[PDB]
Curated annotation (Swiss-Prot):
Annotated disulfide bonds: none
Modifications made to the protein after synthesis: The O-glycosylation (arabinosylation) of the hydroxyproline Pro-7 enhances binding affinity of the CLE44p peptide for its receptor.
Compartment list: Secreted, Extracellular space
Residues linked to a glycan: 7
Tissue expression from the record: Mostly expressed in flowers and leaves. Widely expressed along the vascular strands. In roots and hypocotyls, present in endodermal cells as well as cells in the phloem and the adjacent pericycle.
Organism domain of life: Eukaryota
Subunit composition and interactions: Interacts specifically with the leucine-rich repeat receptor-like protein kinase TDR, especially in the presence of SERK2.
Free-text function comment from the UniProt entry: Extracellular signal peptide that regulates cell fate. May act with TDR as a ligand-receptor pair in a signal transduction pathway that represses tracheary element differentiation but promotes the formation of procambial cells adjacent to phloem cells in the veins. Regulates the transition of protophloem cells from proliferation to differentiation, thus impinging on postembryonic growth capacity of the root meristem; this signaling pathway requires CRN and CLV2.
Outcome of swapping residue 7 to A: Impaired repression of tracheary element differentiation
Protein name, UniProt field: CLE44p
């Protein structure tokens, strides 16, 4: 996971 702020990268 890079930085799409979706598939629990950091935004989770």
């Amino acid at each position: 996971h890079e930085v799409p702020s979706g598939p629990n990268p950091i935004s989770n």
